[PDB]
Amino acid sequence: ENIEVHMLNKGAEGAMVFEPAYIKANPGDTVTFIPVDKGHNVESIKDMIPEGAEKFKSKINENYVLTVTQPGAYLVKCTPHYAMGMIALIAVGDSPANLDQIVSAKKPKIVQERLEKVIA
Ligand SMILES: [Cu+2]
């Protein structure tokens, strides 16, 4: 199946958000990122994607289709706006083995805060 995500300047959660910021998927599903507003992209955060998943980085203002294979959690950011908290969590399969590790990982306070709301 395909899950559609919008990249926006402002959304329910504040400025610079992925909608939805919590994406539940299964191996083989696609995640389509659509920059509704300009100045956004999607990029995998180093060490915040499952063991064996490939790193990715879309072009700014480009529609981007990600195919998810490896089960586990993925924390993706917007390159330009990561520091303002523009992130999304992709959970592939049940009880992602690396979820606790991602929650614990070093990241900007703003990011960490949103991560906490998205998980809740
Ligand atoms: Cu952005």
Curated annotation (Swiss-Prot):
Binds 1 copper ion per subunit. One of its GO terms (molecular function) is electron transfer activity. Induction: Under anaerobic growth conditions and by nitrite. Cu cation binds at residues 40, 78, 81, 86. Keywords: Copper, Electron transport, Metal-binding, Periplasm, Signal, Transport. It comes from the Bacteria. The keyword Cytoplasm does not apply. GO terms for cellular component: periplasmic space. Residues 5-93 form the Plastocyanin-like domain. Its main location: periplasm. This soluble electron transfer copper protein is required for the inactivation of copper-containing nitrite reductase in the presence of oxygen. Serves as a direct electron donor to the nitrite reductase. This is Pseudoazurin. The chain holds residues 24 to 143 of 146 of the full protein.
